Amino acid sequence: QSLEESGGDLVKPGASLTLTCTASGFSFGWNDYMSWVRQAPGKGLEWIGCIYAGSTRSTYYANWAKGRLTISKTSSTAVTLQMTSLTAADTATYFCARGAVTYDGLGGAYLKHFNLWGPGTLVTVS
Amino acid sequence: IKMTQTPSSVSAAVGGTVTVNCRASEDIESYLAWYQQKPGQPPKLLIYDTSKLASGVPSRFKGSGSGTQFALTISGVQCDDAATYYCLYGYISSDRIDFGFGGGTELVVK
Amino acid sequence: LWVTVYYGVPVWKDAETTLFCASDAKAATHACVPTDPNPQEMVLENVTENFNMWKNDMVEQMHTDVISLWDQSLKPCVKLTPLCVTLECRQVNTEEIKNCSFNATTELRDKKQKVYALFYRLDIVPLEEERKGNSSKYRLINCNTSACTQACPKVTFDPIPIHYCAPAGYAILKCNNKTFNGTGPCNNVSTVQCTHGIKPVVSTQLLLNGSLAEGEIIIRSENLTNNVKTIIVHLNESVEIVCTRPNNYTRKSIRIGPGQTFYATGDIIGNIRQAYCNISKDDWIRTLQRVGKKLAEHFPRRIINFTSPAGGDLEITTHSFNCRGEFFYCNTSSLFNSTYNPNDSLDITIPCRIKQIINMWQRVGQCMYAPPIEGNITCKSNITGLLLVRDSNETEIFRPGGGDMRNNWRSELYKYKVVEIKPLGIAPTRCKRGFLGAAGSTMGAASITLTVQARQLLSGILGVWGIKQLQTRVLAIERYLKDQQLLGIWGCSGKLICTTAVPWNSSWSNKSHDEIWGNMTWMQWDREIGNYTNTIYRLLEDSQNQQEQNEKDLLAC
Amino acid sequence: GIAPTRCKRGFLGAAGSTMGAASITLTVQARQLLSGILGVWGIKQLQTRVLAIERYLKDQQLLGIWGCSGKLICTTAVPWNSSWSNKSHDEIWGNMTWMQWDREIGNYTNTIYRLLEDSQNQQEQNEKDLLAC
Ligand SMILES: *[C@@H]1O[C@H](CO)[C@@H](O[C@@H]2O[C@H](CO)[C@@H](O[C@@H]3O[C@H](CO[C@H]4O[C@H](CO)[C@@H](O)[C@H](O)[C@@H]4O)[C@@H](O)[C@H](O[C@H]4O[C@H](CO)[C@@H](O)[C@H](O)[C@@H]4O)[C@@H]3O)[C@H](O)[C@H]2NC(C)=O)[C@H](O)[C@H]1NC(C)=O
Ligand SMILES: *[C@@H]1O[C@H](CO)[C@@H](O[C@@H]2O[C@H](CO)[C@@H](O[C@@H]3O[C@H](CO[C@H]4O[C@H](CO)[C@@H](O)[C@H](O)[C@@H]4O)[C@@H](O)[C@H](O[C@H]4O[C@H](CO)[C@@H](O)[C@H](O)[C@@H]4O)[C@@H]3O)[C@H](O)[C@H]2NC(C)=O)[C@H](O)[C@H]1NC(C)=O
Ligand SMILES: *[C@@H]1O[C@H](CO)[C@@H](O[C@@H]2O[C@H](CO)[C@@H](O[C@@H]3O[C@H](CO)[C@@H](O)[C@H](O)[C@@H]3O)[C@H](O)[C@H]2NC(C)=O)[C@H](O)[C@H]1NC(C)=O
Ligand SMILES: *[C@@H]1O[C@H](CO[C@@H]2O[C@@H](C)[C@@H](O)[C@@H](O)[C@@H]2O)[C@@H](O[C@@H]2O[C@H](CO)[C@@H](O)[C@H](O)[C@H]2NC(C)=O)[C@H](O)[C@H]1NC(C)=O
Ligand SMILES: *[C@@H]1O[C@H](CO)[C@@H](O[C@@H]2O[C@H](CO)[C@@H](O)[C@H](O)[C@H]2NC(C)=O)[C@H](O)[C@H]1NC(C)=O
Ligand SMILES: *[C@@H]1O[C@H](CO)[C@@H](O[C@@H]2O[C@H](CO)[C@@H](O)[C@H](O)[C@H]2NC(C)=O)[C@H](O)[C@H]1NC(C)=O
Ligand SMILES: *[C@@H]1O[C@H](CO)[C@@H](O[C@@H]2O[C@H](CO)[C@@H](O)[C@H](O)[C@H]2NC(C)=O)[C@H](O)[C@H]1NC(C)=O
Ligand SMILES: *[C@@H]1O[C@H](CO)[C@@H](O[C@@H]2O[C@H](CO)[C@@H](O)[C@H](O)[C@H]2NC(C)=O)[C@H](O)[C@H]1NC(C)=O
Ligand SMILES: *[C@@H]1O[C@H](CO)[C@@H](O[C@@H]2O[C@H](CO)[C@@H](O)[C@H](O)[C@H]2NC(C)=O)[C@H](O)[C@H]1NC(C)=O
Ligand SMILES: *[C@@H]1O[C@H](CO)[C@@H](O[C@@H]2O[C@H](CO)[C@@H](O)[C@H](O)[C@H]2NC(C)=O)[C@H](O)[C@H]1NC(C)=O
Ligand SMILES: *[C@@H]1O[C@H](CO)[C@@H](O[C@@H]2O[C@H](CO)[C@@H](O)[C@H](O)[C@H]2NC(C)=O)[C@H](O)[C@H]1NC(C)=O
Ligand SMILES: *[C@@H]1O[C@H](CO)[C@@H](O[C@@H]2O[C@H](CO)[C@@H](O)[C@H](O)[C@H]2NC(C)=O)[C@H](O)[C@H]1NC(C)=O
Ligand SMILES: *[C@@H]1O[C@H](CO)[C@@H](O[C@@H]2O[C@H](CO)[C@@H](O)[C@H](O)[C@H]2NC(C)=O)[C@H](O)[C@H]1NC(C)=O
Ligand SMILES: *[C@@H]1O[C@H](CO)[C@@H](O[C@@H]2O[C@H](CO)[C@@H](O)[C@H](O)[C@H]2NC(C)=O)[C@H](O)[C@H]1NC(C)=O
Ligand SMILES: *[C@@H]1O[C@H](CO)[C@@H](O[C@@H]2O[C@H](CO)[C@@H](O)[C@H](O)[C@H]2NC(C)=O)[C@H](O)[C@H]1NC(C)=O
Ligand SMILES: *[C@@H]1O[C@H](CO)[C@@H](O)[C@H](O)[C@H]1NC(C)=O
Ligand SMILES: *[C@@H]1O[C@H](CO)[C@@H](O)[C@H](O)[C@H]1NC(C)=O
Ligand SMILES: *[C@@H]1O[C@H](CO)[C@@H](O)[C@H](O)[C@H]1NC(C)=O
Ligand SMILES: *[C@@H]1O[C@H](CO)[C@@H](O)[C@H](O)[C@H]1NC(C)=O
Ligand SMILES: *[C@@H]1O[C@H](CO)[C@@H](O)[C@H](O)[C@H]1NC(C)=O
Ligand SMILES: *[C@@H]1O[C@H](CO)[C@@H](O)[C@H](O)[C@H]1NC(C)=O
Ligand SMILES: *[C@@H]1O[C@H](CO)[C@@H](O)[C@H](O)[C@H]1NC(C)=O
Ligand SMILES: *[C@@H]1O[C@H](CO)[C@@H](O)[C@H](O)[C@H]1NC(C)=O
Ligand SMILES: *[C@@H]1O[C@H](CO)[C@@H](O)[C@H](O)[C@H]1NC(C)=O
């Protein structure tokens, strides 16, 4: 099982983006949180957001991209990272990943696993 | 989330030890994880819940902590991987999204 | 771990309830609400449910409501007691129509008048007299049974669709599993507030004007090896059928009492013609060969014989069919005249009989009289299904059948089930002190979702028909108040999430925190700890929410 | 009904007067509403009683979800929109009756209710109490 990732290219600044991450050899099921991160040079992984397989909930860090970021489920095997206007995409690369959480039973959950990662891609502009 | 780390880089004698410190501003009840990122790669998970060794990861990577201070100790260290070590944390709720990851520390030994 | 109380838990129980009768907003209609069904269907991902069309109370409920509204329409109509007199009949000279004379009651009760009317032989019973070729004496059929009622002008025979809608707290689950055979699991379900409109079309043998199958022809039965069960065949293609009564009758009006009249058949305009139905031959043949094959799959290594009518009693042997209020009893023996062997113009004429005395719904004594209808009595319809009955000879012999009207509704209602939502539930946590969309997912995932979704339950805050509505409203109030009351006594205002002081018993469940929250849905959990419901409630109401007040506040004296 | 104030978190006798005057009066007068707590004729009575119960419960329920027990006056955490009304504090309270006000902001009724029930009375509990784990 592995993740594939593609769809990045050079686009006009402020242009949209639809990256696709694919579940090669598998489908996403219970407790599969399909997430995206941003990798800047000299930094780690900044959080973009994730979706829950088995439902329609999409959680993302709007404090970074409210109105800029949508994470959408497509096939049972794939997720699309949808951006409405690219800037920082020219600095940090994107990676998709398959993770999991522990639920508290009090209305939330904490991260534990990020076991599968896509190869990632830079999506720059000019 | 609010978090810091120290140092920005690490070194050790080969076969010795390395310490990487994750210093959250936030008080976390053992929900953090350590990652190893080799150049050109996504980070590999090393440790769960601040101290549990992940499958496929050697015993070289051990750690602990509580509250705001957590650390990764690497022992019998090689830097063959030339990785940056990182601290991860995040919480999902419907009212707030609390997530982050550190800048990590670059390791070189000899 | 500790017991945490949750509100808005997406679980349900199979449940029977009176559904609202909804009508056509654009509109037997006064009894139902002319609103928008608002079929906001939601698909439940990863949810499998058990459906059973043969045990569906919606079918039984519909049967009762269809009959009840039909009966109300005849309530103000005239009982033809004055016609139960000796009839002197002669052959019409303008062989099923007889010319009969009566001594009818006039507006004045002390006078009689000699009148005549034409009747169908099927509605007439001979007295102890023989045909002489000129005249004989008769009784109207059923004068020894009931004062048959004349349908009033403006009784409607329009099969206006009915929609059933759930009361708050209930949901209707629809099965979208194409090829589902009516029983067992359905792996694709969704919920609606209301069903599609169902036209209460009444027929036997051939089901008309229903919904066609999405995929291939589906054959459903309670038990396919039981020769006493009816087999319902759902076609995926319609077959064109048009029926007509081309004989130009005139309606006469006979006073039969002080303020009431009888509508009589008379003055045939010239020609005598037999009523009949027009059925496409190629479509009929293709349909049966296809049905034959599907039956062969259920009954392999057998010859299939769609070869016989019931045996001769008109009420069960012919195709009961209505056309604009007219009643046809058509002979389908020419349709069901073929076989199938898996390894082996252009129309069909169906002669029809016409009858004015109707024993509607197979009841006895509840007789309706159908007045003659003038003009072009032609109706074009779609055959959408068949009701077949399986009969030693390594042959499976089938006959068309029916008469149990429930089957005409099972054929539409097989897709629906009614369940009751049960919003309260508990689960262990580590802390001491669109509603069903979160279903099929784990409890953990749902618990996050429910911090918002639970509030969708807050959207739920004519004679016998008045009663049905009052019972529905009163029950909705009663259930609401009981849940509010339990939450109150458990100290769970702010009810979506309520931690308590009751410890978790490993005897209820010995699964770990993550084994429970990440590997179970709420319904699975509800089943696993379901019999401890009363135990938990007692611990919460009698002990912890009493002790937690008395030991803290009375000390403040 | 609602109206803006500066604070963040005989029944109809007070009519024809300004909202301000009524708001003082209603600290007492609002309680007069608590006095409201054969064939077809049996039905007419049952429908009447059931409806009275239904309306009562719906109002109690809304107040419950908005965190407004002690309902005569309930401050909330929802900010006032100038788009609903751009009149000043005194222009509203001293120059309008309650019915005039109800008409002026009447089509925002559902907006305000959503802000109160879906957001402020959810956020105000989750961000304070779940943290006490
Ligand atoms: C529709 O409904 C069905 C109901 O069955 C859901 O089924 C769930 O599917 C998920 C994903 O396939 C299941 O989770 C998987 O369970 C496997 C078994 O675990 C046992 O063995 C491991 C071995 O160490 C033990 O640790 C564990 O305690 C058990 O004893 C795991 O092996 C799977 O892990 C694999 O994928 C993960 C991904 O990160 C890797 O990290 C792992 O290394 C490994 O490769 C996985 O955990 C779940 O149990 C199923 N539920 C049930 C009841 O069977 C569907 O998912 C659901 N679909 C949707 C869309 O909701
Ligand atoms: C399967 O479904 C089909 C389709 O609906 C049914 O066939 C229809 O049945 C209805 C009766 O239930 C027929 O309706 C009758 O049509 C007569 C002819 O209408 C003429 O004028 C209209 C004006 O717009 C034209 O459109 C039309 O083409 C004709 O020119 C009407 O005269 C009848 O009126 C009676 O009822 C009304 C109700 O208020 C009274 O006011 C009138 O005085 C009068 O009593 C009536 O409208 C309809 O024509 C049928 N269509 C076809 C194609 O046959 C099938 O019957 C149904 N299957 C079964 C088994 O029911
Ligand atoms: C309704 O259900 C029937 C039954 O499944 C469907 O019948 C199928 O029709 C297709 C053609 O449209 C048939 O395929 C072809 O049949 C010929 C017959 O000699 C064969 O030579 C071709 O190679 C090919 O198979 C198909 O076999 C047939 N199925 C059966 C069981 O006979 C029908 O299409 C369905 N109608 C709708 C609207 O879905
Ligand atoms: C109290 O209200 C009256 C009524 O004014 C109407 O409602 C207001 C909210 C606004 O929409 C006005 O335009 C409406 O006419 C006020 O009387 C008005 O005063 C203006 C001043 O130029 C005058 O042109 C209007 O004709 C007056 N309206 C009437 C009906 O005579 C009055 O001034 C308000 N009092 C205070 C202190 O604000
Ligand atoms: C049914 O019978 C009535 C009489 O029994 C027929 O009506 C009579 O027809 C004769 C023909 O000349 C008239 O002279 C009479 O005045 C008619 N009325 C009566 C009351 O006798 C009637 O035509 C027959 N109906 C049909 C369809 O043949
Ligand atoms: C209507 O009433 C008249 C009554 O006069 C019936 O006609 C008589 O029937 C008796 C029966 O035996 C005969 O003996 C009389 O000769 C008949 N009189 C006439 C003038 O015909 C008449 O038959 C009754 N109508 C029906 C339909 O029975
Ligand atoms: C009303 O009359 C009908 C017709 O005579 C009766 O039905 C007949 O009953 C006998 C009894 O053995 C049967 O042999 C006939 O075949 C029946 N006729 C038909 C058409 O089925 C009916 O029972 C009578 N009803 C009452 C209440 O007396
Ligand atoms: C619901 O649909 C599923 C497919 O959508 C049907 O699954 C079939 O189940 C039988 C049982 O032995 C299998 O042999 C078939 O191979 C299954 N089909 C597929 C496509 O996998 C299911 O049976 C349907 N429900 C009912 C009652 O028929
Ligand atoms: C409808 O489909 C179900 C599912 O295939 C049939 O029920 C199965 O019948 C076989 C017969 O031996 C049993 O072994 C299975 O255990 C049954 N499964 C279930 C879920 O019941 C059912 O009989 C079919 N019904 C009809 C009328 O054909
Ligand atoms: C499960 O049932 C749902 C509901 O009928 C199916 O969803 C429909 O799929 C068609 C395919 O194009 C869409 O046009 C409809 O709009 C969908 N309906 C809804 C309400 O979304 C779904 O495809 C079914 N899945 C299977 C495997 O049969
Ligand atoms: C359909 O019903 C028939 C009976 O109504 C079932 O077959 C019989 O079941 C009884 C039950 O004890 C047995 O004693 C008989 O021996 C059975 N008959 C035969 C021929 O074996 C039949 O199994 C039911 N079929 C299904 C699919 O449920
Ligand atoms: C339906 O029509 C068939 C065909 O006409 C009827 O069967 C015929 O009945 C007559 C009665 O004497 C026989 O002489 C014919 O030989 C029969 N035809 C065949 C092909 O066997 C049948 O009785 C009619 N059924 C009903 C209920 O009226
Ligand atoms: C049922 O089908 C049979 C044939 O399968 C029909 O009988 C045949 O009718 C044709 C008409 O010209 C004759 O040439 C054949 O000789 C007849 N066959 C036999 C064996 O006699 C029969 O009439 C059909 N019945 C109905 C009710 O339609
Ligand atoms: C199934 O239907 C076929 C006809 O479609 C029946 O065939 C008849 O068989 C008898 C046997 O001697 C012949 O005399 C008839 O002439 C055949 N009919 C025709 C039209 O030729 C067959 O018997 C039926 N099978 C069963 C078990 O009822
Ligand atoms: C269906 O209806 C049509 C007419 O509406 C019937 O057509 C007639 O069939 C007879 C048969 O010989 C012809 O002589 C007539 O000329 C036809 N009419 C026309 C206008 O051409 C047709 O027979 C009916 N079909 C059935 C099954 O009875
Ligand atoms: C009917 O006609 C026959 C012919 O002879 C006759 O004998 C018989 O009596 C007539 N019947 C009546 C009722 O007039
Ligand atoms: C009969 O089937 C045809 C097929 O196109 C459809 O258009 C028509 O509306 C159907 N009639 C009825 C009464 O359902
Ligand atoms: C079809 O196969 C069955 C298998 O038992 C056989 O009995 C039957 O005679 C066959 N029919 C033909 C037409 O070969
Ligand atoms: C019946 O006959 C009259 C005679 O003029 C004609 O106008 C009418 O259309 C006919 N009705 C039918 C149904 O044929
Ligand atoms: C009845 O309606 C059909 C519809 O086309 C028509 O062909 C037929 O002639 C009509 N009959 C009469 C008597 O109007
Ligand atoms: C669990 O149930 C047993 C039954 O006797 C009881 O004794 C025990 O105290 C219970 N434990 C909890 C946590 O309620
Ligand atoms: C509840 O009782 C039923 C009786 O058959 C049993 O099957 C089920 O497992 C019981 N559930 C619990 C929680 O004990
Ligand atoms: C007023 O309404 C506008 C409508 O878009 C909204 O954007 C703004 O935030 C609202 N302000 C307040 C105080 O609710
Ligand atoms: C509400 O809508 C009506 C529609 O005519 C409008 O006249 C009225 O001013 C509106 N009120 C508000 C508060 O927008």
Numbering used by the authors:
A (entry chain H): 2 to 35, 35A, 36 to 52, 52A, 52B, 53 to 82, 82A, 82B, ...
B (entry chain L): 2 to 95, 95A, 95B, 95C, 95D, 96 to 107
C (entry chain A): 34 to 60, 70 to 136, 152 to 185, 185A, 185B, 185C, 185D, 186 to 309, ...
D (entry chain B): 495 to 503, 521 to 548, 568 to 663
Provide the publication's sentences verbatim:
The HIV-1 surface-exposed functional Env spike is the sole virally encoded target for broadly neutralizing antibodies (bNAbs). Most cross-conserved sites on the Env spike are occluded by host-derived N-glycans that appear as “self” and sterically limit naive B cell recognition of the underlying polypeptide surface. Functional gaps in the contiguous glycan shield are the protein surfaces of the receptor CD4 binding site (CD4bs) and conserved residues proximal to the furin cleavage site at the Env interface. From the Δglycan-primed rabbit displaying the broadest and most potent neutralizing responses, we isolated two vaccine-elicited bNAbs (vax-bNabs), E70 and 1C2, directed to two distinct sites of Env vulnerability.
An inter-protomer cysteine disulfide linkage (501C-663C; Yang et al., 2018) prevented 1C2-mediated dissociation by native gel analysis. Next, we obtained a high-resolution cryo-EM structure of the 1C2:16055 NFL TD 2CC+ complex at ∼3.9 Å resolution. The cryo-EM-derived model reveals that 1C2 can accommodate the N88 glycan with primary contacts between W31 of HCDR1 and the glycan base as well as polar interactions between the HC framework 3 residue R94 and a branching arm sugar. The cryo-EM reconstruction of 1C2-bound Env reveals that the Ab surrounds the FPPR of gp41 and the HCDR3 wraps underneath toward the tryptophan clasp residues (middle). When comparing the positions of the N88 and N625 glycans in the 1C2-bound trimer, the HC of 3BC315 would clash with the N88 glycan, suggesting a different mode of interaction compared to 1C2. We also compared the neutralization capacity of 1C2 to 3BC315 in a 208-virus panel, revealing greater breadth of 1C2 at 87% compared to 49% for 3BC315 (IC50 at <50 μg/mL).
